Design a binder for this molecule. Sequence first.
Ligand SMILES: *[C@@H]1O[C@H](CO[C@@H]2O[C@@H](C)[C@@H](O)[C@@H](O)[C@@H]2O)[C@@H](O[C@@H]2O[C@H](CO)[C@@H](O[C@@H]3O[C@H](CO[C@H]4O[C@H](CO)[C@@H](O)[C@H](O)[C@@H]4O[C@@H]4O[C@H](CO)[C@@H](O)[C@H](O)[C@H]4NC(C)=O)[C@@H](O)[C@H](O[C@H]4O[C@H](CO)[C@@H](O)[C@H](O)[C@@H]4O[C@@H]4O[C@H](CO)[C@@H](O)[C@H](O)[C@H]4NC(C)=O)[C@@H]3O)[C@H](O)[C@H]2NC(C)=O)[C@H](O)[C@H]1NC(C)=O
Ligand SMILES: *[C@@H]1O[C@H](CO[C@@H]2O[C@@H](C)[C@@H](O)[C@@H](O)[C@@H]2O)[C@@H](O[C@@H]2O[C@H](CO)[C@@H](O[C@@H]3O[C@H](CO[C@H]4O[C@H](CO)[C@@H](O)[C@H](O)[C@@H]4O[C@@H]4O[C@H](CO)[C@@H](O)[C@H](O)[C@H]4NC(C)=O)[C@@H](O)[C@H](O[C@H]4O[C@H](CO)[C@@H](O)[C@H](O)[C@@H]4O[C@@H]4O[C@H](CO)[C@@H](O)[C@H](O)[C@H]4NC(C)=O)[C@@H]3O)[C@H](O)[C@H]2NC(C)=O)[C@H](O)[C@H]1NC(C)=O
Ligand SMILES: [Cl-]
Lengths: 207, 207
Amino acid sequence: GPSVFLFPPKPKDTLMISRTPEVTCVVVDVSHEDPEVKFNWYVDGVEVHNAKTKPREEQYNSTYRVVSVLTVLHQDWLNGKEYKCKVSNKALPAPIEKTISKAKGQPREPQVYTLPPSREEMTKNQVSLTCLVKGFYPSDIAVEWESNGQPENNYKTTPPVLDSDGSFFLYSKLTVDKSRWQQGNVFSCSVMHEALHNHYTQKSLSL
Amino acid sequence: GPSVFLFPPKPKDTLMISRTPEVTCVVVDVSHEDPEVKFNWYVDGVEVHNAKTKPREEQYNSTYRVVSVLTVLHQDWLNGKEYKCKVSNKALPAPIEKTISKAKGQPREPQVYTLPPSREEMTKNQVSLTCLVKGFYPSDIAVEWESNGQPENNYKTTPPVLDSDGSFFLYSKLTVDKSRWQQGNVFSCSVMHEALHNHYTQKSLSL
Ligand SMILES: *[C@@H]1O[C@H](CO[C@@H]2O[C@@H](C)[C@@H](O)[C@@H](O)[C@@H]2O)[C@@H](O[C@@H]2O[C@H](CO)[C@@H](O[C@@H]3O[C@H](CO[C@H]4O[C@H](CO)[C@@H](O)[C@H](O)[C@@H]4O[C@@H]4O[C@H](CO)[C@@H](O)[C@H](O)[C@H]4NC(C)=O)[C@@H](O)[C@H](O[C@H]4O[C@H](CO)[C@@H](O)[C@H](O)[C@@H]4O[C@@H]4O[C@H](CO)[C@@H](O)[C@H](O)[C@H]4NC(C)=O)[C@@H]3O)[C@H](O)[C@H]2NC(C)=O)[C@H](O)[C@H]1NC(C)=O
Ligand SMILES: *[C@@H]1O[C@H](CO[C@@H]2O[C@@H](C)[C@@H](O)[C@@H](O)[C@@H]2O)[C@@H](O[C@@H]2O[C@H](CO)[C@@H](O[C@@H]3O[C@H](CO[C@H]4O[C@H](CO)[C@@H](O)[C@H](O)[C@@H]4O[C@@H]4O[C@H](CO)[C@@H](O)[C@H](O)[C@H]4NC(C)=O)[C@@H](O)[C@H](O[C@H]4O[C@H](CO)[C@@H](O)[C@H](O)[C@@H]4O[C@@H]4O[C@H](CO)[C@@H](O)[C@H](O)[C@H]4NC(C)=O)[C@@H]3O)[C@H](O)[C@H]2NC(C)=O)[C@H](O)[C@H]1NC(C)=O
Ligand SMILES: [Cl-]
């Protein structure tokens, strides 16, 4: 019999009003006998029906895969609304049901500090700009780097680490050629989190 | 004597209601002799006071460098209000002033097309996904790439090029390992411009 998996919107979709977040219900392992599959979507227990379901597609193990996609209102998701997908298909005895929702917990607003590179580090070819993001809950967060215009490639972020007061912190490290840092170029760490004003803050840093 | 330069907001900052746009006034070639510099900000003729001046930072020239940022309203900038920085130094015969505004001109809407890699490029271990953005005005624009919610590394973008019909176009090229493309991953080019509905559009691309 089939399998269903239920995928949440990615955080930055929920946090920007410009972008458009979606919940995705996918069923796989549906037999060739009865390829037809019905989706029922509930938001907080009431049926909704603006979901786009796409045409079924056969995979190379000779079973179909079909996906149903529901656009969510940003505020609905951020207010902890439960999204439930219910799949019916003739091979199942009882229809099967998944539910997801934003991670629970009292939200906490992160502080965002930028740390210039250590002086022992500027004897080197590349240098590291550091962004400390601490005090935030829940752990859904986005951290990015920009420079006088366009995004930066060469950065890595730590996974959220549980701190001693129950909130998370993390660090983001951006490595730049030292000649760019020495020229007074400005680099910005932007953070997106549901607990910030406007879900967005930015801290700049330069020599 | 002291030079004056005045930089506009970052396009992304003006197009997103959650980000926060600033006009920046930089003064360089500041002498030790008469070190104090006072700024005076004017929106559409009338004076303003919420500017933030960061204290002087001396350079390797032994010149000084003084900056003052003014936060602007998104709508004020998009509606063409003129921002004027007037700077006084007791080593200037007359205070010196500059003025910026959004690029004048009727706004045209960009068409966004995504172009897969050439069949000839599948010989290499990396391939180029292409994003063509054409028919837009003014040239203040932001292009970014992403995949499964996260910002995609590489990609470079051309400057806007004046088309024959009065508008601009640009291309953005993203380099992915060929295996990532052949697997079926979905990449997406997102674009931000005044003339787009919601100032934002996304176009996807995948094998
Ligand atoms: C003393 O040292 C300082 C420090 O310089 C720094 O250290 C030295 C050792 C070197 O490493 C330098 O490379 C390094 O910058 C010197 O201060 C510099 O002084 C020069 C000239 O005096 C200035 O040049 C101007 O640069 C701007 C662009 O500058 C931006 O881009 C740089 C990126 O490479 C960046 O380093 C700058 O900081 C600045 O970055 C912007 O910053 C803001 C806020 O921080 C940010 O929000 C922006 O996003 C960011 N932008 C970018 C793109 O990064 C340039 O625009 C100027 O061009 C005008 O003048 C040119 C010559 O005339 C000409 O080519 C242009 O067309 C333009 O001409 C003017 O055009 C307009 C119309 O469009 C009109 O208003 C004018 O009439 C017209 N003409 C004139 C005459 O104005 C210009 O090239 C540096 O910015 C400045 N450095 C800094 C950090 O501010 C200083 O010169 C030294 N003193 C000496 C040697 O005696
Ligand atoms: C027949 O083929 C199909 C299609 O596959 C294709 O053909 C085969 C032959 C191969 O060649 C494939 O390579 C080829 O692609 C098979 O379909 C697959 O079926 C398996 C399960 O049978 C599914 O596994 C699940 O995977 C999800 C995560 O999947 C995401 O990430 C993948 C990359 O790693 C990506 O390929 C997927 O498409 C999917 O991508 C997401 O897509 C959404 C929507 O488009 C998008 O928004 C997201 O951005 C994107 N996400 C990412 C990360 O890219 C995984 O979550 C599941 O894990 C559960 O089960 C594990 C085992 O128990 C467990 O360890 C996990 O924790 C999790 O367990 C559950 O978790 C919670 C609590 O922990 C709770 O719900 C449950 O209690 C718990 N337990 C259980 C049991 O559920 C899961 O592993 C594949 O996704 C699916 N592939 C596709 C493309 O749909 C099919 O299986 C084949 N049939 C056979 C062999 O008989
Ligand atoms: Cl990037």
